[PDB]
Symmetry: C3
């Protein structure tokens, strides 16, 4: 059994989050066949929200976030789908919506073969904490 | 005498820096020999993939022990990333990587807790079923 | 997102594609569209882009203390299992430029798809200071 967030030496390691709203896995299927770019972006936004919710609940508020550091976005990708940056851009912009300047981050976005429970997107992150 | 072991890839098994240990992705090896190959859902079933993930985790802790001179210098694990070579439609990667997480718990107790990511990849080096990497805090 | 984030002596370098002066050079799946020699060239360009991003963030590579961890993703055709040979080209480029400071831990995986159809993507974490 893993933990959603680990805090150590001023760094928060946030586990991979799936696109859940209210507990329910909302976006399943391969991007590029079963999902198009706009649905996959909705999934990535939900993942980003789950990351920040886990971080907030671990810290007792987002005021203790000094800045985000690195975001990794995995997109379950059908043959020929190559717009993973546009998918994960929805997560990056959500981080900006919530955290302003503190939301800036380095990033990787890759197309994977499969994700847990058939999820379309999975997002993990590393943050600096005060 | 496997070439992959004697003079391995162009990378270090573990890098230690500023209180952090960066452990390279480990394949499911037993005594040097790759034990578990294939895509989970076509070439392996879930129980075999769990055995593979357990071996990967054991290899992670062996690399850490050999770099540190003993696991007593592990303050705690921080983050584990598990890659599972996944056949079409296989979506039980958390159950696979759970075997690695459970091995870490069995060996390290409270120091074994970690954040985690689990993803299904298309292929892994040498046809390995699972690859596990990790970041740990060290003394 | 940012190409590089520097925090508490660590540089987080975003995932880099195989570019020449900014222009994407190597696209396609390794094992079908590209052979091993072309994929090695692609990984070499990714590594060069990583070092260029680090150089502009630091104002010179003299402030790179050492590399720490490299993650290599290879867009892989069915049955292609030679990702270490591909990412070795990035690792060896790091060695050619930085000598002993170029050593790193590593992960290498075969993904289904990469941004814009790129053959290889490389991200890294480095230690920084004069």
């Amino acid at each position: 059994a893993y933990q959603p967030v680990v805090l150590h030496a001023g760094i928060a390691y946030v586990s991979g989050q799936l696109p859940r709203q209210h507990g329910e896995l909302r976006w399943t299927g391969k991007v590029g066949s079963e999902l198009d770019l706009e649905q996959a972006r909705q999934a990535a936004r939900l993942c980003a929200a789950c990351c920040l919710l886990a971080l907030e609940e671990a810290l007792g508020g987002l005021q203790r976030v000094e800045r985000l550091l690195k975001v990794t976005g995995y997109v379950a990708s059908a043959a020929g789908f190559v717009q993973q940056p546009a998918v994960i851009d929805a997560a990056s912009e959500y981080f900006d919506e919530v955290l302003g300047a503190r939301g800036g981050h380095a990033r990787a976005a890759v197309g994977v073969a499969e994700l847990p429970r058939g999820a379309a997107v999975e997002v993990e992150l590393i943050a600096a904490v005060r």
